[PDB]
């Protein structure tokens, strides 16, 4: 990497299905606060409501399946 | 050893030839002529396992080694000539090619044109195997 990325914070807008082999992760749709034009799909471990916000070290990589 | 250009604004261009079979991978880097190579490392040179010669881990190791060698030489931009085994057999590239190209890009080296240089035939000779072929 060798790239310094400032921390960007993002807000959930819709909950989706749960990925993972044991049903431990959750695919979810989350949108940013600084620029609400683009929305990203991320994998989150833990119980997630609709309405709260998230903390992201990166804002680039896409979510995927269990592996 | 070094190059006569300025190292502030502009960058130099070479080509990296990436062979990707199903049991080996190559990261071969030559000049823009394609004749004068500078450094060639293969995925079988970094792991002590004959079955693990074609993998993203060996591809990342070979890509980091050739990126370090090119940084000591001073080659700062590359064009990818990606190819599979080609020929009469299969044409799908190996699984380590994407990770090798990703690890070459992650070292801080510029990436230009990307094209597929698989030597596809019009119609080649008879392939390996019988009429029933290879079965198990």
């Amino acid at each position: 990497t060798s790239r310094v990325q400032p921390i960007k914070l993002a807000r959930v807008t819709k909950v989706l299905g749960r990925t993972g082999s044991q049903g431990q992760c959750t695919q979810v749709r989350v949108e940013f606060m600084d620029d609400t034009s683009r929305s990203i799909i991320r994998n989150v471990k833990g119980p997630v409501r609709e309405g709260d916000v998230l903390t992201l070290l990166e804002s680039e990589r896409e979510a995927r399946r269990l592996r | 050893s070094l190059g006569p250009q300025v190292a502030e604004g502009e960058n130099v261009f070479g080509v990296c030839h990436i062979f990707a079979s199903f049991n080996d991978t190559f990261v071969h880097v030559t000049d823009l002529s394609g004749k004068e190579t500078i450094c060639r490392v293969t995925g079988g040179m970094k792991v002590k396992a004959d079955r693990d010669e074609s993998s993203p881990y060996a591809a990342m190791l070979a890509a980091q080694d050739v990126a370090q060698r090119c940084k000591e030489l001073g080659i700062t931009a590359l064009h990818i000539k990606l190819r599979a085994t080609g020929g009469n057999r299969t044409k799908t590239p190996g699984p380590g090619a994407q990770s090798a190209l990703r690890a070459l890009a992650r070292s801080g080296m510029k990436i230009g044109r990307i094209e597929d240089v698989t030597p596809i035939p019009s119609d080649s000779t008879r392939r390996k195997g019988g009429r029933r072929g290879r079965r198990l």
Binding site: - | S1, G3, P4, F13, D31, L32, S33, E36, I38, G112
Partner: protein
């Protein structure tokens, strides 16, 4: 034991004058070690470059070849050797439910440069066409191929290399073929697929020096 990049030179290559950007890249070769001469091992090097890295803003998937034949010091001056196409574009235009037409012509310029003009052609379905097949008869394909051969032997025989190389840079021969063949069967994807060098004359330094200005 010793590293083999200490007795290595560095050279810069140049493109001929029909293009916009003269500087295209760099190469390197070893020093003159005894009977071997570094200029002798610098001749047989084909430079395979793209058109969009050679012009300012034009078609990117067209490609050209450059062969080195001029060196005097810290400079290599090339010439046209072949025009190719990217495989992704060629595989993108090829699709089902259409007729592919291919014509190859052997033709010579005014000077001793023997070319081989490969070309392709792909049919187009109309905007109100309800059918799916959209093929053509074999004699229609023969008439289209004859028209393509006489067009690409018309435009190379009359002129020299310096005009047809400048003509190959934009879509001119393809647009002429597409405009002429609208009456036989309307086809849209016509491009010169490959140009191959066949014969080259005795080497002359004056024409090569006047190539670059």
């Amino acid at each position: 034991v010793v590293d083999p990049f200490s007795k290595k030179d560095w050279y810069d290559v140049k493109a001929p004058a029909m293009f916009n950007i003269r500087n295209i890249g760099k190469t390197l070769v070893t020093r003159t070690q005894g009977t071997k001469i570094a200029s002798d091992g610098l001749k047989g090097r084909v430079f395979e470059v793209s058109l969009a890295d050679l012009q300012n803003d034009e078609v990117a998937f067209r490609k050209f070849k450059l062969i080195t034949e001029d060196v005097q010091g810290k400079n290599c001056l090339t010439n046209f050797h072949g025009m190719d196409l990217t495989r992704d574009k060629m595989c993108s235009m090829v699709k089902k439910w259409q007729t592919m037409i291919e014509a190859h012509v052997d033709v010579k310029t005014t000077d001793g440069y023997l070319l081989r003009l490969f070309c392709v052609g792909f049919t187009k379905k109309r905007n109100n066409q309800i059918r799916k097949t959209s093929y053509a008869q074999h004699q229609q394909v023969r008439q289209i191929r004859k028209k393509m051969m006489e067009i690409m032997t018309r435009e190379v025989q009359t002129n020299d290399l310096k005009e047809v190389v400048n003509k190959l840079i934009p879509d001119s021969i393809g647009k002429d073929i597409e405009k002429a063949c609208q009456s036989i069967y309307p086809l849209h994807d016509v491009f010169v697929r490959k140009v191959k060098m066949l014969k080259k004359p005795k080497f002359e330094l004056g024409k090569l020096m006047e190539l670059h200005g």
